[PDB]
Amino acid sequence: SPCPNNWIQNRESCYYVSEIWSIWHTSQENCLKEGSTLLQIESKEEMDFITGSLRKIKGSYDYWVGLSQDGHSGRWLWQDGSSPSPGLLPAEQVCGYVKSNSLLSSNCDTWKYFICEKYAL
Ligand SMILES: [Ca+2]
Secondary structure (H helix, E strand, O other): OOOOOOOEEEOOEEEEEOOOOEOHHHHHHHHHHOOOEEOOOOOHHHHHHHHHHHOOOOOOOEEEEEEEEOOOOOOEEEOOOOOOOOOOOOOOOEEEEEEOOEEEEEEOOOOEEEEEEEEOO
């Protein structure tokens, strides 16, 4: 009831972990269809939850998150225009993804799974 069916809750947030691949932009459109957006990780607490959650899921797959790198600055932004902290910078158009315990960087036009996030009721 705070979260949709098939979604997982942590505090104010609900998350959906995909079982299909898409490119970064299309993954975002998939989240948008569900009234959500690609996962944004704004704290160590949330990162720890996300890494913990994926560990319960087979494989150490790649999951798009809502981070993209400007082609002029090289600077990372979440899709709401906020900057990640120095603890959540992807390791070295380009977009970010989570794999196991790490945030990494990839060409946006590649196929990965994705994680969506929306506010719980
Ligand atoms: Ca978040």
